[PDB]
Every structure is written in C-alpha cells, then in structure tokens.
Amino acid sequence: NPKVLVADDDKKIAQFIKTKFEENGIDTTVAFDGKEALFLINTNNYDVIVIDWMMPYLDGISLLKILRKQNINTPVIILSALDSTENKIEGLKSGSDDYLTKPFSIDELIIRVNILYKRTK
Amino acid sequence: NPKVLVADDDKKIAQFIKTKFEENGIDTTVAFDGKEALFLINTNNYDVIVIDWMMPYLDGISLLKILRKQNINTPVIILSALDSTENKIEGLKSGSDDYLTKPFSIDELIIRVNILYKRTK
Ligand SMILES: [Ca+2]
Ligand SMILES: [Ca+2]
Ligand SMILES: [Cl-]
Ligand SMILES: [Cl-]
Ligand code: NA
Ligand code: NA
Ligand code: NA
Ligand code: NA
C-alpha cells in the first residue's frame, strides 16, 4: 500500500479524503495544521504528501518550500483554492508534483496519488 | 485631498471603493492587476496605497514586498480574505500599515486612509 500524509485543517475534508483513500489501497495519516505536518514529515517516511494551501502555523506552499530546502523530495500534491493558471504555475515551480484546484475530484486525486507512487517505485 | 491608488481585479469592488472614496475627499486611481499597480506606483506619487491580496501577475503581498525592497515606503493597506491573526501578522511584517479582512467595512477603510494620510503629513 502507498503510505500518504494528508494535511488540512478542515476536519470534514480531511476525514473524507482519508475514508476514500483507505477504501482504495492507500494507508493515510492526517495532520490538521502545518506544524504537525512538518513534524510528521520529518519523523516518518511517506510515499506521497497531500497538502492543503492554507492551514495554521504553516500554509501549504510555505511548508513545501521548507521541505524542498531540506532536500526532502517526496512527491507532493497541493490542494488549493487559488485556481488561476498563474497560481498553479507558482505551486509547481515551488516544488509540487501536481496542483489540484478546489473543488477537486476525489477520483482524480486518488489516481494522481497512485501515479506518483508508481513513478517513485 | 489625499491621493490614493486602489488595486483589485474585482471591478465591482474597485468601483465601489472608488465611489465611496471620492464621495469623501479622496482622489482615487484604480489598477485592475498587480502589473498595472506596480507600473502606476513607480510612475506616480500616492499618499496611500490600498492593495487586494489576490490579483493577476502580482498578488498583493508580493507587490508589497517588492515595494518595500525598492525602498518605496508609502503607507499600504492590505485587503485580504486570509482572516486569521497569523495571516494578519504576516501581512503587517511584510510591510503593510494596516490589514483589513474581507468582508471589510468601507467606513473603516476610509477612516484608516485618512489616518495614514494625516500621519504622513
Ligand atoms: Ca485549509
Ligand atoms: Ca482580488
Ligand atoms: Cl487565483
Ligand atoms: Cl486564514
Ligand atoms: Na488502510
Ligand atoms: Na504563511
Ligand atoms: Na475626487
Ligand atoms: Na504570487
């Protein structure tokens, strides 16, 4: 099973994602803000990381930039309310492997998680 | 009259702000994205600058950081949908003189424009 971290402060959305991921073959840990996410990412191995764009302590893009500075190169998917092409490009340049605008498709998110897991062996 | 630039890509909100400002004694120029705002700020003198948090080409915080790097110290008010205290603090540390969460009060915005104009003689 892919091992994935999901970081969002919206507990309903986080629970929804976790339920759908574990329905499929994806073992999922939830972090409810950027501080907990940073800690978990630095003390556990994940195959893919799914990060919401806005949470307490560290927003998603800021956490991603910290990770890439730390030479943590785990595949990252950003979930963001900033839906312009310019903001998608900024998220990708910041080091994300994909960038899904909200409202997002859970089916697409699961497929992209699996694609990234397959690519990173 | 205070001379003020208002930057937002939402034309209805920009027009509303301009109407209320000019009703009061505030001469107002509108810029509809961050590129036009940057150009106008570098080619005109303004007493106060009101910047929306998200627009094409340059978001409000990024424009503010560019301005403060350029040693342009004109008072800036940020209008933002990011309403947590943490995000307000980040906006202030980025160089803004005030930070109003949306939905904002036009009456408060006018009063704060006038306070900043009075303080900068
Ligand atoms: Ca969130
Ligand atoms: Ca806007
Ligand atoms: Cl956007
Ligand atoms: Cl917020
Ligand atoms: Na499981
Ligand atoms: Na932040
Ligand atoms: Na006028
Ligand atoms: Na930006």
Author numbering:
A (entry chain A), B (entry chain A): 4 to 34, 36 to 125
Extract from the study:
In summary, we conclude that Francisella BfpR is a response regulator of the OmpR/PhoP family that negatively regulates the expression of some FPI proteins and biofilm formation and positively regulates resistance to AMPs. Response regulators are transcription factors composed of two domains, a receiver (REC) domain which is connected to a DNA-binding domain through a flexible linker. On a molecular level, the response regulator propagates the signal by accepting the phosphate onto a conserved aspartate located within the REC domain. Alignments of FTN_452 to other bacterial response regulators suggest that FTN_1452 is a member of the OmpR/PhoP family.
The structure of the BfpR N-terminal REC domain (BfpRN) was solved using X-ray crystallography. The structure was refined to 1.80 Å resolution with a crystallographic Rwork of 0.1824 and Rfree of 0.2019. The BfpRN construct used for crystallization was composed of residues Met1 to Ala129 with three additional N-terminal residues remaining after cleavage of the affinity tag. Only residues Asn4 through Lys124 could be traced into the electron density.
